[PDB]
Symmetry: C5
Amino acid sequence: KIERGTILTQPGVFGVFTMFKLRPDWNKVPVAERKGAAEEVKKLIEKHKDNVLVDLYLTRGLETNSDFFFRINAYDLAKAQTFMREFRSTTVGKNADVFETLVGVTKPLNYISKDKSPGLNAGLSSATYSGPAPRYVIVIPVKKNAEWWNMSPEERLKEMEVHTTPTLAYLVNVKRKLYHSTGLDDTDFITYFETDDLTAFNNLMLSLAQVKENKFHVRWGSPTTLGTIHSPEDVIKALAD
Amino acid sequence: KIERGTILTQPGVFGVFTMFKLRPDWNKVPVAERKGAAEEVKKLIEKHKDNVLVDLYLTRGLETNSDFFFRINAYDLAKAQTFMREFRSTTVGKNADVFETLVGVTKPLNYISKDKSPGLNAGLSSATYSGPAPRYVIVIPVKKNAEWWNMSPEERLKEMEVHTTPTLAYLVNVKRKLYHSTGLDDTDFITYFETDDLTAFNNLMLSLAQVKENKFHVRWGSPTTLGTIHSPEDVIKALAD
Amino acid sequence: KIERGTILTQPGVFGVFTMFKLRPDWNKVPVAERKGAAEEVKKLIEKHKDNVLVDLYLTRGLETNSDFFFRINAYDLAKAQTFMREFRSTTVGKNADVFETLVGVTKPLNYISKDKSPGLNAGLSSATYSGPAPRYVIVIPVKKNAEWWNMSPEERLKEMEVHTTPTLAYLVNVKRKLYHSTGLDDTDFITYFETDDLTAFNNLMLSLAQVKENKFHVRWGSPTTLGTIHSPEDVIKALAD
Amino acid sequence: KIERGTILTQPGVFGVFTMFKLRPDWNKVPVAERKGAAEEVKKLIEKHKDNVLVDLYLTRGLETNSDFFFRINAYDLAKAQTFMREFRSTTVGKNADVFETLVGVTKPLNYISKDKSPGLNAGLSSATYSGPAPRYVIVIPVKKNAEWWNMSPEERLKEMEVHTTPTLAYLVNVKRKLYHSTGLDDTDFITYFETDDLTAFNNLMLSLAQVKENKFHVRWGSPTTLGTIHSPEDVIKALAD
Amino acid sequence: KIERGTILTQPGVFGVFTMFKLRPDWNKVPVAERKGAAEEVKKLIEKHKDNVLVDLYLTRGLETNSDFFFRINAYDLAKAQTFMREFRSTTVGKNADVFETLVGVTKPLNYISKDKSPGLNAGLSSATYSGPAPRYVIVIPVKKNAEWWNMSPEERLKEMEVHTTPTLAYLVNVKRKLYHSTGLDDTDFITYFETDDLTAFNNLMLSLAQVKENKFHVRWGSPTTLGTIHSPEDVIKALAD
Ligand code: HEM
Ligand code: HEM
Ligand code: HEM
Ligand code: HEM
Ligand code: HEM
Ligand SMILES: O=N[O-]
Ligand SMILES: O=N[O-]
Ligand SMILES: O=N[O-]
Ligand SMILES: O=N[O-]
Ligand SMILES: O=N[O-]
Ligand SMILES: [Ca+2]
Ligand SMILES: [Ca+2]
Ligand SMILES: [Ca+2]
Ligand SMILES: [Ca+2]
Ligand SMILES: [Ca+2]
C-alpha cells in the first residue's frame, strides 16, 4: 500500500519527474491505436498501484521541450525506475522521447523546524490552501552555489527564515513540495507547485527573487515547466488528436 | 468576448509566444494540401474568436530557428494552451516543430506610473505612433540578475526612470508591449515591438545598452526574433510554396 | 536599380548573412538535377537583379555548421527576406537546413569620422587594397558587454582610435565591411572580411586581441566563419559532386 | 589474466565509462533478434575475459541521456577501445547512440597517504562496507578550476584532509573509486560510487558541498548519472521488452 | 611536392582537423561497399600526394562525438578544403557527419626562441623522442582570455617560460605540434600530441594546470580528443565491420 495522503507527506520518498516530448511520427500512428493509448496508461498505473504514486500533467502548447510529464513517488527508487521503464514500452511511450528527468528525495525540515525556528514553523504547518482547485503545475529545479553551502548552518538558517517570511501568505494560493537532489541528479532541489493564480505565482517568485538567497542560485528553472493539471487518462486523451 | 483594442490594453492578460520551425518533409506535402493550409488556420482563428487573440508573423528567411511564430493573448492561460494545442494538429502544425515558447502576463505599471513617476508617465501615456504602418515585429525576452532584484524599490525606480528617458522619443516610431514572466517561464520579461524603421530600432537598443540597467541583464535576446508582419492567412500562404 | 559599387558603399543598407548545411539526402538527388541546381540559383539572382545584391561563399570542408552561406544586401530588409525565402524554395534550398543567420544594417561612421577623428578617417578613406583577388572570406559576429556601452563616447572613441591604429596597415591586405545589429539580432555587429593572406589575417586578429577593447567582448566569433570566395553559380557547382 | 579483485584495486588501470541511448528504431528490431541481443553481449564479454573488465548498468527510466552504460577497466586503453568498438557492432550496439564517454586512469594516493596524512589514511584503509549489496551506481565527473591547481600542495592537502573528515564514515554505506582524467578527457576526475542508501548518498554530497574544496569545482556532475546495478545480461534483457 | 618531414616542420603550414561521426545508416551500407571504402580513401590521398599531407585517427569507442578524425597539412588552405570536400563525397564520407573542424596555421616561435629565451630554447631543441611508436593521439583546442592578450609581451614571455620548464622532461615521452588560430577559427591554438604513455601525459597536463598561465584559459579541451594512431586505410578498415 501507497496512500496518496501519506506518501506525499513522509520523508524518504523519491520523486522522479520525467518530461516527454512526442515525436512527429506519432501523428501517423493509426487513429485507433492512438485512441487506445490512454486506457493502456491507465491500466499501467493500476498495475503499479502498490509500488509507486503516479501524476501526469499536460504541457503541449505551453512548453518547447515537453508535451506532457510524469511525477512519480516511491519509497523505492528502483520501483520508480521500473514503472517509467514500463511506461516507455507503452504505445505513447514508444512515440515520445525523454527531454528531462529529475530525481529527488524527500527529507525532514532542515531550517524551519520546531527546534530551530519554532515561530515560522507553526505558521508553516498550520496553513491551509483555500479556494478553487488548482489547474496549473509548475516544476522548478534549483541549485545553489558552493558559496551558499559554505555558509554556516546558522547563516543559511537566517537566509531561509527570510525565504519563509513573505511566502507563508501564498500558501492559501499555491501548494508546494520540496525534493532533495544534491548528488542524486544535476540539481540541489526539485520544487513542485500547484496553483490556480499565475499572477499570484508571479508575485510569489518576485518576492523570492528580491531576497539575498537568490544571489546564490546557479539554476532556478531551465527548464521552468508550467503545465496544466488533469487525470492521467485525460492527459493522454488530449495528446491523442 | 474579445476585442483586439481592449485585450492589448488591459492587465492580467497572458502572452504566449511560440516560434515554430517547419520540417523538411513539408516540401513534400503536395502543393494543394499546402495551399489549403492557410484557410485551415484562418478557420481555427475564427473558431477561437472568443477565447484568444491570435497574431502570426513571418520569420522564414530572417531567423535560424523559426519560419514563423504566433502571439496569443488570453484571459486564461489554459485557453492559450488549447488554441496552441489545436494549431499543432493543423496541416501546417503537423509539419512544424516548436523551437521556442515564452509565457507571460501583463501587469499594471511598476515604476513609471502616475503616482511614482508623474512627469514621465504623462509623457508615456500621451504619445502616439506616427507614419507608415509597421512592417516589422521584434520579440525579446529579458532576465535581470539577483543583484537587480535585491536593489530597493527606490534604487530600481531610479534605473527605470533612466530607461524611460531616452526611449519615450521612439514611440513616434516604435510600438511596445511588456509581458511579465518570473516564475512562469525562464525569463523575467517578454518585450514586443512593431516598427517600420529598423535603423531607428537599432538606435533605440543602443540607447538602452548604454545605461546602467543593461548591467543586470543576463538574458536580453537569445533569441532576439525579428520577422515581418502580415495577416495570419498571408503568413501561411507565404510558407506554402 | 542596385549597383554593386553603390550599395556596398552607402548607409542604411541591410545585411543578411545565412549559413546553410546540406542534408544527407542531397547526395541522393540524381547528379545533374544537382548540377543544374546552379542554373536555378543563377536565374533567381537575375530575377532579383533589382531587389537585392547577392553573394555566395563555399564553406564545405572548412566549417562544421555550414557548406555554404549567402551575403544579401538590400535597401529594404523585406526584400532580403523574399530573396532568401525564394532561395529556400530552390532545389538546393530544399535540401539544406539553415544553421545561422545574422541580420545587420550599415550606418555612418560613429567614431572614426572626419569631425571626431580627422587623421585616421583620412587614412581610412584614402587606403587602397593591393595584391591578388581575395580567395577567402571571414564573417565574424561581435557583441560587447554592458560595461563597454556604459563607457562615455569619449572613452569609447579613444578605444576605437586604438582599434584603428594598428589595423589601417592591413587595408592593403584585407577588405572589411561593418554591419550593425544591436536589437536586430543576437549580436552587436557583423564583420565581413575578404583576404588572400590568412597568416596576415591571423596577425590582424591578434593585434586586436591585445587591446583594451577586446576586454569587453562577450562574442567575437562563435561562429568564426572562414570560407572560400567564388561566383554564385560556381559555389553551387562545387556543392554538386 | 584479469581478475576482478585485483584490477579494481591497482594503479595504472584505465577506466572507460560510456553512456548509450537506444534509438527509436530499436523497438522495430524484430522481437527475436532483440531477445537474442543479451546472449550476444554475454559472449562478447567472455571473448574479452582476458582483455578488459566489464560492468554494465541500467539507467533507462532514471536518466534523459542514457538507457545503459558500461564501465570498462583495462590495463591498456587500446583494449578498452577494441571492446567498445566491438560492442557497437552488437545488435544493441547498432541500435544505440553514444551520449557520454569518460576516459580516466587510476593513480596512487596523492593526499591521504600513509606518509602525508597517516591519521586519516588508517581510517581510510581499515574501513569496511556493511549491509546490503548495493543496488545503485552513481558516476560523477569532477573538474576543478585553475585556482585550485595553482594552490600549493600543502594547501590542497589541507583541503583534501577536509574532504576526508566527514566522509570516512560513509564507507560503511557507500563504495567509492577514483579515476584521474586531466589531459586525457574533458574532466579532472571520474568518481564512481555504489550504495544502497540514496538518502545516505545525498547527505554525503551535502557534506562535501559544504567544505571549501567545493568552491573550486567548475564541473561536479553534468551529468550526474545514477542508475541501477545488475549483471550484463540482465541489463540487456531489461532493455529488450 | 609535399614531404611529410618538411611540411611538419615549417612555418606557414595550414592545419585542418576535422572530426567525423558515422551516421547509423552506414551499418546498412552493403558489407562489400563498406570493405571497398578503405581503398577509396587510400586512392584519394594518393590523388592529393602533392596537394596536402593526410593523417587519419581512430576515435570510435573512446569519443562521444567522433569515430574518426583527419589532420590535413597544406601550404594552401584552399587545397585542404578541396581535399576534405572530395573526402566527403567518398563512400564513408557520404555516411558521416562533421562534428568538429579546427583551422590553424603554423607560425615561428613567439616566446621560447633563441633570441628571447636562449637557455630554455636549448633544452627544448636538445632531447629527442625515444620510446615506442606512439599508439595514442591527443588533440586539444586552446584559447586564452583578453586579460592574457593584454599582458605585455614581456609578461607573457615570463609565463611561457614557466610553461616550458616542467615539460622538458616529457621530451622523450610525448610528441607535440602547435597550430595558431586566432581570427581563423574559434580558438587561439590547436595542440597536437602523440604518445604511448597516457599516465605520463596525464602528469604533464597536471603540471601545466598548476602554473599561472592555466589561469587564462577559456578553452583548454571541449573537446579534448584522445584516440588511436593507425594508417588511414587501417582506420577505415576499423570502421567497416
Ligand atoms: C510561497 C510559499 C512557500 C513557503 C511557505 C516556503 C517555505 C519553505 C521553507 C519553510 C523552507 C525550509 C524547509 C527546510 O529546510 O526544511 C523552504 C525551502 C526551500 N524553498 Fe520554499 N517556500 C515557498 C515557496 C517557494 C518558491 C516559490 C520557491 C522557488 C522554487 C521555493 C524554493 C525553495 C527551495 C529551493 C528550498 C531549499 C533551500 C535549501 O536548500 O536550503 N519555495 N521553503
Ligand atoms: C522606446 C520605447 C520604450 C519605452 C517608451 C519603454 C518604456 C518602459 C517603461 C516606462 C517601463 C516601466 C514599466 C513599469 O514598470 O510599469 C519599461 C520597462 C521595461 N522595458 Fe521598456 N521601453 C521602451 C523600449 C524598450 C526596449 C527596446 C526594451 C528591450 C527589450 C525594453 C525592455 C523593458 C523591460 C525588460 C522592462 C521591465 C523592467 C523591470 O522588470 O523592472 N523597453 N519600459
Ligand atoms: C585591419 C582592418 C580594419 C580596419 C581598417 C578597421 C577599422 C575600423 C574602424 C575605423 C572602425 C570604426 C567605424 C565606425 O565607428 O564608424 C571599426 C569598427 C569595428 N571593427 Fe574594425 N577594422 C579593421 C579590422 C577589424 C577586425 C579584424 C575586426 C574583428 C572582427 C574588426 C571589428 C570591428 C568591430 C566589431 C567594430 C565596431 C566597434 C563598435 O561597435 O563600436 N575590425 N573598425
Ligand atoms: C564518503 C566517501 C569518500 C571518501 C572516504 C573520499 C575520500 C577521498 C580521499 C581520501 C581522497 C584523496 C585521495 C588521494 O589524493 O589519493 C579523495 C579524492 C577525491 N574525491 Fe573523494 N571521498 C569520498 C566521497 C567522495 C564524493 C561524494 C565525491 C564527489 C564526487 C568525491 C570526489 C573526489 C574527487 C574529485 C577527488 C580528487 C581530488 C583531487 O583531485 O585532488 N569523493 N576522496
Ligand atoms: C610537453 C611537451 C611540451 C613542450 C616541450 C611545450 C613547449 C612549448 C613552447 C616552447 C611554447 C612557446 C612556443 C612559442 O611561443 O613560439 C609553447 C606554447 C604553447 N603550448 Fe606547449 N609544450 C608542451 C606541452 C604542451 C601541452 C600539454 C599543452 C596543452 C595542451 C601545450 C599548449 C601550448 C599552447 C596553447 C601554447 C601557445 C602559448 C601562447 O599562445 O602564448 N603545450 N609550448
Ligand atoms: O520551498 N518550497 O518548495
Ligand atoms: O518596455 N517596452 O516593452
Ligand atoms: O571594422 N571592420 O569591420
Ligand atoms: O574520493 N572518492 O572518489
Ligand atoms: O605547446 N606544444 O603544442
Ligand atoms: Ca542524472
Ligand atoms: Ca517553460
Ligand atoms: Ca534573430
Ligand atoms: Ca574526449
Ligand atoms: Ca570556423
